[PDB]
Structure 1
Amino acid sequence: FVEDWDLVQTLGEGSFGEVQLAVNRVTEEAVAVKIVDNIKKEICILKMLNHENVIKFYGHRREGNIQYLFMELASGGSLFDRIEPDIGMPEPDAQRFFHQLMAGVVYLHGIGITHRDIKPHNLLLDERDNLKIADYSLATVFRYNNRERLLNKMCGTLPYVAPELLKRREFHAEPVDVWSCGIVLTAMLAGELPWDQPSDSCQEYSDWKEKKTYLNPWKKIDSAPLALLHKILVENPSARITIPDIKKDRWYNKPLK
């Protein structure tokens, strides 16, 4: 239905941003295409992306009102669908996905991009279960010409968002993305999100800051990954662990089945 490609089936919906499976009549190659009708910026960021744990951009076509963004197809679906509610997933799978997630985030941060909405719905799987960080509609540049800019816009998804974003006028980009990786890791290992939002008026968040790890979800989590979560989910962003230091963590380097 667009030039050489047939639009075969709906892969996912969105806020005026639907994604279709697209197959080339000539060559049979299947990709994914996002149909939308701001996106200049998104396209600009998408064209920068070249890494095995990040979704690839193939190109775009405007056809009147509708813009078509042609992107890598992740035929394994989302990480969201591999997480069993109240259980999670086997720790070795969770570690491998975490490794890949960190590789993606290091890449993005190294090109000065912050994703700002890391969560299991946006973490897609290829056919060999390699994880790909997808959806750059909230992404932005936080480093340009080697100069950092602080962020001030609120975005993300509350249960994944770092607390400084609810409390500070301006904050550093990178620790926000790290925080959301720790909520992802929590979800993979326990099959449940720990709080609705990281605010002191939220009892489960208060409980975590008082170290009540005999409660859920923390009691489902082995002590080694939990020690890593204690370094990631730290309320002050300048004391929170950085990715270089995550890579030296004991669990991160533990050999697992």
Structure 2
Amino acid sequence: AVPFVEDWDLVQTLGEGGEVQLAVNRVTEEAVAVKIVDMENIKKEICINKMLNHENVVKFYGHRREGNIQYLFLEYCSGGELFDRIEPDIGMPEPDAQRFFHQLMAGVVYLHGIGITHRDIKPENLLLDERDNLKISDFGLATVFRYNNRERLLNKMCGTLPYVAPELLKRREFHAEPVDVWSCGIVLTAMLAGELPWDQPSDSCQEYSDWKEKKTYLNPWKKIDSAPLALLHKILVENPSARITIPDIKKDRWYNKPLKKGAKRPRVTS
């Protein structure tokens, strides 16, 4: 009934690869992210996005089609990507990484609970709102791995090589959930060391061979404290059947270690 409420001005480019624009409502000044896709690929991304509703998953508000162009109305996260909070070769303070890792697990538990695998978890796909709350973004490579309580094994090779689990390079078929668990472990490694451990997880990769031989005196492992390193030892396990599951990540000692204070709240003295 209110005129002009459906009008959004595109005020700035947020990302590319089509593009993601910052859209501001003409009347309310509400900020959303509009993903512009110049076209089955986007049809599956829209259908998976309509299933999503969680505080650590980028919100989907709706979609509009202007002939050949698809417009996806998605949550605006003013904090940007987790990628730009990682200082090269340093990482970030361990309590900040623990808090981001808690929020990443909550989002992944949610997705896996409704039978969705993201398949491309990496810091470029983890967005931060104004309060630094993590949001899993971009369901362009996501798929349903469980339907009618029946698990379907995956075979499609996808994701990003430094974050992919070794079974995707070695086996024809693999379970979906240990693959996302592995990529979260590489995110945790990146957050605590500011560097990726290997180009890809194969025996032909020397840094990967060094990890399987427990050469933790080498980088990036030498920069990581023993408590989060003991967790990484459980996540970055070559055999996906022996790899730690999320319920067991939730019982890990470092995972449950008190490290971070709540957000700074205004206070006065006397």
Task: Give yes or no for TM over 0.5.
Answer: yes
Segments of 5+ residues of structure 2 without an aligned counterpart are 260-269
Task: Say which one has the larger Rg.
Answer: 2
Task: Report if the CA contact (8 A) 2:5-2:25 is conserved.
Answer: no
Inter-CA distance 244–7: structure 2 relative to 1 (3 Å threshold): same
2: CA distance, partners of 1:233 / 1:207: 13
C-alpha displacement of 1:26: 1.6
2:153 is aligned to: 150
1:108 is aligned to: 111
1:36 is aligned to: 37
1: CA distance, partners of 2:113 / 2:181: 14
Q: Judge which range, 225-234 or 20-29, deviates more.
A: 20-29
Per-residue CA deviations over 1:144-191 (Å, capped at 9, x if unaligned) read 000000000000000000000000000000000000000000000000
Per-residue CA deviations over 1:6-27 (Å, capped at 9, x if unaligned) read 111101101xx20000011121
Per-residue CA deviations over 1:59-83 (Å, capped at 9, x if unaligned) read 0110011110000000100100000
Segments of 5+ residues of structure 1 without an aligned counterpart are none
1: CA distance, partners of 2:105 / 2:36: 29
1:122 is aligned to: 125
1:72 is aligned to: 75
2: CA distance, partners of 1:39 / 1:84: 33
User: What is the aligned-residue RMSD (CA, Å)?
Assistant: 2.0
Task: Report if the CA contact (8 A) 2:79-2:130 is conserved.
Answer: yes
1: CA distance, partners of 2:61 / 2:102: 26
2:243 is aligned to: 240
Percent of aligned pairs with the same amino acid = 96
C-alpha displacement of 1:2: 11
Aligned length: 255
TM-score (norm 1): 0.98
Q: Judge which range, 1-10 or 224-233, deviates more.
A: 1-10
Equivalent position SS for 2:209: helix
Per-residue CA deviations over 1:96-151 (Å, capped at 9, x if unaligned) read 00000000000000000000000000000000000000000000000000000000
Equivalent position SS for 1:31: strand
C-alpha displacement of 1:3: 5.4
Structure 1 residue ranges (4+ consecutive) displaced by more than 2 angstroms after TM superposition = none
Per-residue CA deviations over 1:21-61 (Å, capped at 9, x if unaligned) read 00111211110100001211110000010000000000011
2: CA distance, partners of 1:220 / 1:29: 42
2: CA distance, partners of 1:82 / 1:29: 25
